[PDB]
């Protein structure tokens, strides 16, 4: 499961 990264 990917770590969340905001943009």
């Amino acid at each position: 499961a990917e770590f969340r990264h905001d943009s």
Partner: antibody
Amino acid sequence: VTLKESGPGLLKPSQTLSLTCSFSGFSIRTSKVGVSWIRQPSGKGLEWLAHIYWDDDKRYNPSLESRLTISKDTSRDMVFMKITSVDTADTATYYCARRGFYGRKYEVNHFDYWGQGTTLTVSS
Amino acid sequence: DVLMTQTPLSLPVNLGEQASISCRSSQSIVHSNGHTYLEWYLQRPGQSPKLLIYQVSTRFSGVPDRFSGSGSGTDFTLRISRVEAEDLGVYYCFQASLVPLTFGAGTKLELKR
């Protein structure tokens, strides 16, 4: 920018660890930085525990997740960690780490500031 | 989960020599957003970990240009061109693309004798 961890120093096995990380020199609210807890058990390397985003979304390391609760109070510029049912293996230094970035590149984030840590020894 | 394997785990050097540390992830750590979240941290003896390199090859502010990060996908290298006394300590590679975020075991850069 400074980060300061606080913790009880010593606990008995089965107690709940309550950690605080207090931030100075910027605003959690305004910066929208994410924050992690990372620990270094006695004689071991670093292990990531948990992370909380600006909107209170959370992620955990499955190896310990069932025992972990991360939370924050933006109005106090604080992030917290609870670890239930401590035992000897929880003897470690606990670090708070800021997942900062250079504005406004939210996607280019990394652990830019770490505190001094708080050490815990667990013993009966 | 992603295993981060550093080689070697102990790296004795003479001050002034080059140093090289390899990090292999067990799967690709290219994130769906396009970035590869590979970071290098140094923990000097008796100090807190500090960021050296992020996004594989970008030095964090204040980090000397004798440090260089390279690699792609699963295959990463930290190079130090000329080791100085302040460089000795334990180096960790770290991936923040997949949960759990994971560190390597650490490579101790130590003085040779």
